[PDB]
Amino acid sequence: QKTLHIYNWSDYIAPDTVANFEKETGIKVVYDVFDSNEVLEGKLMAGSTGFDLVVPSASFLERQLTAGVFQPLDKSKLPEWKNLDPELLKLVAKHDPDNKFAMPYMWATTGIGYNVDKVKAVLGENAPVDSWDLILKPENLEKLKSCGVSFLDAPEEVFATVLNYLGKDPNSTKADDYTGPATDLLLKLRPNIRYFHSSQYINDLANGDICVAIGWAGDVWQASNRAKEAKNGVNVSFSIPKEGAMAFFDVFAMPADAKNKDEAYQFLNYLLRPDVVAHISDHVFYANANKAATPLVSAEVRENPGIYPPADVRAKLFTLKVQDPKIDRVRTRAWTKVKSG
Ligand SMILES: COCCOC[C@@H](C)OC[C@@H](C)N
Ligand SMILES: COCCOC[C@H](C)N
Ligand SMILES: COCCOC[C@H](C)N
Ligand SMILES: N=C(N)NCCCCN
Ligand SMILES: [Cl-]
Ligand SMILES: [Cl-]
Ligand SMILES: [Cl-]
Ligand SMILES: [Cl-]
């Protein structure tokens, strides 16, 4: 009996994807989930993960490659590879030279999820939901505390977002930018932040328990759809703010000690099938990286500019770079100060 172990982000597959694969191939899939790049990276660096496939963000994979934790993908076993968007492959190749190790899966942005009615009640009809001012201006966050504020537990993304907002290089290599202005602003915001978490905010937005969050786009659209399906009167939306936002590219990769490689390739080729991955986008509200799949995606998802953004919006997006050891240390120490504030 063939088995296959997969570690993916939570809320990042359709409900029947695995069952359909199992029914087709006769392979038993053990599927587990995470909500943190740091948790995944720690597992990869500490020893065997026990998984045959894992799904880091590409900027984290860039760092992980130098430790040798992945094995290169045999493209001859990935004939549906051609379906992938060549322009996205080129962007991911900045992290994964010649696309040797990573298969792009989904991509989106780190923006603001919010309860439309609650934010307009607190900050008025002209609340600045088009701007990071909504949540990074202390005077606004002090008022939104009234209905609940969450930030991602994602230090590289939060600091890059703050640096961009402050007019710095999002990937600044100046240590004082982290210890000075970025820490200063985050510490002024901290008293108003209910929690730092990268998955509880979905249901809390959907249920009305928080009214604003730093969130990943498709997670927030899921929250919006859950409220609609519940017919609970909660109206959640998502904003890519005017100052720009971070884009991320999540990728499948194969640990170097994977046990069931043939099964892993069967699963990857299944995901390269346009109807399979379009079906996933339909349920998780994320743009997939498969150009052949785009016309098969539901119009509700494909025509949402907060999911498949147009060129003028993509032009304002930035990506993470890997930081050197000094900046990595300074950033991690600053994040510790912020969470316990
Ligand atoms: C795993 O392969 C058999 C398919 O069963 C799926 C469900 C019904 O049972 C396993 C649960 C515990 N995830
Ligand atoms: C467990 O082996 C793979 C076959 O399972 C089919 C499931 C019941 N959908
Ligand atoms: C065609 O989608 C690629 C999206 O890329 C975003 C970059 C930052 N421009
Ligand atoms: N920022 C990232 N690399 N990934 C976020 C994906 C979240 C899917 N629920
Ligand atoms: Cl069994
Ligand atoms: Cl090595
Ligand atoms: Cl008003
Ligand atoms: Cl449709």
Swiss-Prot record:
Activity control summary: Transport is feedback inhibited by intracellular polyamines.
Main location: periplasm
Pfam families on file: SBP_bac_8
Disulfide pattern: 147-211
Molecular function terms, GO-annotated: putrescine binding
UniProt keyword Glycoprotein, yes or no: no
InterPro entries attached to this UniProt entry: SBP, Sperm_putr-bd
Cellular compartments per GO CC: ATP-binding cassette (ABC) transporter complex, substrate-binding subunit-containing; membrane; outer membrane-bounded periplasmic space
Positions that bind putrescine: 10, 219, 250
Functional note: Part of the ABC transporter complex PotFGHI involved in putrescine uptake. Binds putrescine. Imports putrescine for maintenance of the optimal concentration of polyamines necessary for cell growth in the presence of glucose.
Subunit structure of this chain's protein: The complex is composed of two ATP-binding proteins (PotG), two transmembrane proteins (PotH and PotI) and a solute-binding protein (PotF).
UniProt similarity note: Belongs to the bacterial solute-binding protein PotD/PotF family.
NCBIfam families: PRK10682.1
Name of the featured protein: Putrescine-binding periplasmic protein PotF
Organism: Escherichia coli (strain K12)
Gene: potF
